[PDB]
Amino acid sequence: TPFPWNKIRLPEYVIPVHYDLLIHAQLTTLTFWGTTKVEITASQPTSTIILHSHHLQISRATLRKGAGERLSEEPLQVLEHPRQEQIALLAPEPLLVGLPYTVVIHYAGQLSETFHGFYKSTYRTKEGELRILASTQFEPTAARMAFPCFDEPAFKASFSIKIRREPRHLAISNMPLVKSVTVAEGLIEDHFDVTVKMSTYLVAFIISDFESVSKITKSGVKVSVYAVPDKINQADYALDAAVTLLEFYEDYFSIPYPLPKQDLAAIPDFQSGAMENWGLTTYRESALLFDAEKSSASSKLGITMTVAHELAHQWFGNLVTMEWWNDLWLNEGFAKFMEFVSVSVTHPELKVGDYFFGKCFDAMEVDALQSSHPVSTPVENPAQIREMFDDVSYDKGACILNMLREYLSADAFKSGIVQYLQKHSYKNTKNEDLWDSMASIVDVKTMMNTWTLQRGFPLITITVRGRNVHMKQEHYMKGTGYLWHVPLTFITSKSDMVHRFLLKTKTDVLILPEEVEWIKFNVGMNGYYIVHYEDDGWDSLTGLLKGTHTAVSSNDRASLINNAFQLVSIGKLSIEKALDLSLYLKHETEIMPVFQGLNELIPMYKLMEKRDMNEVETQFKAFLIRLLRDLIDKQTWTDEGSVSERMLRSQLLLLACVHNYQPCVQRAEGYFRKWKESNGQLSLPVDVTLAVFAVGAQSTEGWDFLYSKYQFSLSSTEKSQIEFALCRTQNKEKLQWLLDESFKGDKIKTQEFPQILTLIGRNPVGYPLAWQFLRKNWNKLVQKFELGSSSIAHMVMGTTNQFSTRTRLEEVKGFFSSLKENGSQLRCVQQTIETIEENIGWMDKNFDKIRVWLQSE
Ligand SMILES: O=C(CN1C(=O)COc2ccc(Br)cc21)NC1(C(=O)O)CCC(F)(F)CC1
Ligand SMILES: O=C(CN1C(=O)COc2ccc(Br)cc21)NC1(C(=O)O)CCC(F)(F)CC1
Ligand SMILES: [Zn+2]
């Protein structure tokens, strides 16, 4: 019997209203069974119900009509289309239009051994015992692996969840537990309250032995953090941050959080950083748990931002959801942007607003390639949908919202988002709904369509002739018509007021009131565009940075460093002039411009490390250390100062030690010797630990001692610092061991494998082993992480994007084209090919220039 539906999307005429999900998971055999009851209505006569199901064995399906006295049941015939992840249920007579029916499906499955669906997670107690738990991760299309459903985000429905479990386990889900009932064969059935109307991807449930801590918000919401018993003592920071952030968002949006409780659970095995399931947000332990003695300043910032992101989603994603995955940025760009809006207010000590522009420069790297896609773009299958979870949806999405907020003003933008959330509460939206809301408070639709429907971003060229300022825009591309409505901003030598000019055409002109010594566009890097200055423009800004660098903000200095190097890539500025500009960094003190200098200069030597260029590579590395030597020398070996001072310290000390700067290497060797002689008991300053461990792991004894401490650590920062240090070994047998062991998941968890593969891919001696490992183990890696996932995209780019020869380009093209349906069409593959093509052209043009410049410098 042919399958009666030929489309990836489900029919639009059968709609669910409510699901009753009963799940029994047997953690001793990894089998689960369920009964799903879904109340539906049909708007056109049909005898066939199509819905999603993947890897579930259906034992029986029946169609009910009526209740009690008038109940009628009809058996349904079940058909399956595994490639479309669908099942068809066939009734013996047509459904009556507009009348309620209940589909009842009994099925079984096996707990997934991936990080998606209803999956197995494990950990070892500090006493050595292996513990098994089961958790869910459904976004985007994995709810269908746990229960048959209409698994598209616009089919919203309420869910009543019941979990049968052993008495030794605890079950939690989206809503509060209302009753526990003893049932047959020594089990307990927990009943959770009904959810509000929501998408299938947000259903969650966890069966575990977690401990918890709680705190109540001013609005009466019970917030709890859940974690393994040996780590609940690290939950207080996130619990306090979650309460403060939930209160912030309730007040900011003028829309209360609608559920009685909000849980934050730290899962021992988790693929992404975290997930926003309504009422039960989930996290990697590293993204939630803070150890006041061992956690880094960057991890404290990361936890605060991750909790802020997941809580923003309770409104931007859960309450209002995109209609389809083509508009995922409506959830992700907004959640990413709201991390900055909220934490800027709640945790002013972190100064996060200072770091926002760095995410925009991240998105520009990828968005400058021909393989970039517009923010809103069509997707159909699960691998294509997973690809939407990328720097374009998150970082470009947040950056264009920041640009729009600065353009409209914060209060008008806030009014627009409140109207949007109120109007579309418990419903789904598309781009046009957001523009209509923003305009209900001036032009938003035409402008924002240029930023969401075209890939890339413009280069703005400025030409100054006395008072006359000529502006032009063109599409910036590495390696056609494009036009944007660009909300330009500028300051000058005579005015530090941020002046505004909306450029909606290819060119325009403005007249300054009086002549100026310099002009600087894109103030604070709040716009998603780059700027080139004709004539003496770059010499003037180079002179400004060299003589009076504090004449512009720290973020404006970072923007000039980034844009000068981006202009070398397209031939608008010579590499010598960009390197001459970078010389001002000898007197720079602020984290953002220092880090931006590293971001531009470090990749040049990473390319050289994989080429026959030792002489220039050594000279370039020596030039970098000479440039930052005074700042390196001023660093104290302590945890003193602000979060920015701590992050700057840690990065500089690590960089100096990696480059064999003897004053730092000798200090690190002394701390490692003392720490090792104390049997790893010694509390080292967290901010010097990366440098100390990286130096210590360069001997066989130090590497072995460091790895021996890894199994006992309960600190996510300490385990990350150890992983980084072990991956810097130049012993190829130890590097292959790290890959084999993290891939296996026993001594080092598989959730760390993408990071270890990238670190080994960046190791100056081990880099061929990472690309080799990826090729050899491709099928198993895709099975574990999924085609289209950000984890697979990070492994592809991490192992290949620093290649710069035609032989390496053909390895990449040849390997991925050979995969056919199992990866040849991945967007990350096209991105790494275009990146390697750019690296080939850039090194051919600039290598000799850099060699000559270094000999003169
Ligand atoms: O180079 C890298 C990793 N990395 C890239 O691969 C590509 O571009 C980058 C830009 C900025 C920064 Br910070 C790091 C990178 N890390 C180090 C290295 O030389 O491999 C150098 C820095 C260290 F010293 F802090 C760690 C090691
Ligand atoms: O390398 C990374 C980031 N990173 C990965 O990319 C892959 O997985 C990891 C595992 C452990 C640690 Br610690 C870092 C990473 N960061 C730095 C760098 O880019 O070289 C710059 C910041 C730094 F100084 F804190 C560590 C090194
Ligand atoms: Zn998100």
Author numbering: 45 to 485, 515 to 552, 559 to 936
What did the original publication write about this model?
Endoplasmic reticulum aminopeptidase 1 (ERAP1) cleaves the N-terminal amino acids of peptides, which can then bind onto major histocompatibility class I (MHC-I) molecules for presentation onto the cell surface, driving the activation of adaptive immune responses. Given that ERAP1-trimmed peptides modulate the adaptive immune response, controlling ERAP1 activity is an attractive strategy for cancer immunotherapy, autoimmune diseases and increasing immune responses against pathogens. Herein we describe the hit-to-lead optimization of a series of cyclohexyl acid ERAP1 inhibitors, found by X-ray crystallography to bind at an allosteric regulatory site. Binding of peptides to the regulatory site plays a critical role in determining ERAP1 substrate length requirements and the extent to which peptide trimming occurs through a “molecular ruler” mechanism.
Modified cyclohexane rings, such as sulfide 6 and difluorocyclohexane 7, resulted in further increases in potency. The binding modes of compound 7 (ERAP1 pIC50 = 7.7) and compound 13 (ERAP1 pIC50 = 8.6) largely overlaid well. As predicted for the FEP pose for compound 10, the most significant difference was in the orientation of the bicyclic ring, which presented the bromine atom and phenyl ring of compounds 7 and 13, respectively, into the lipophilic pocket. Comparing the two structures, there was also a significant movement of Gln730 to better fit the size and orientation of the ligand. To examine this selectivity, we tested compound 7, which was one of the most potent compounds in both the biochemical and cellular assays at the time. Pleasingly, 7 showed no measurable inhibition of ERAP2 or IRAP (pIC50 < 4.0, n = 1) and thus had >1,000-fold ERAP1 selectivity. In contrast, compound 7 had a significantly reduced unbound in vivo clearance with both good oral exposure and bioavailability. Furthermore, compound 7 demonstrated a much lower in vitro intrinsic clearance in rat and human hepatocytes, is 10-fold less lipophilic than compound 13, and has a much higher FaSSIF solubility. Furthermore, compound 7 had promising pharmacokinetic properties in rats, providing an excellent starting point for further optimization, which will be the subject of future publications.
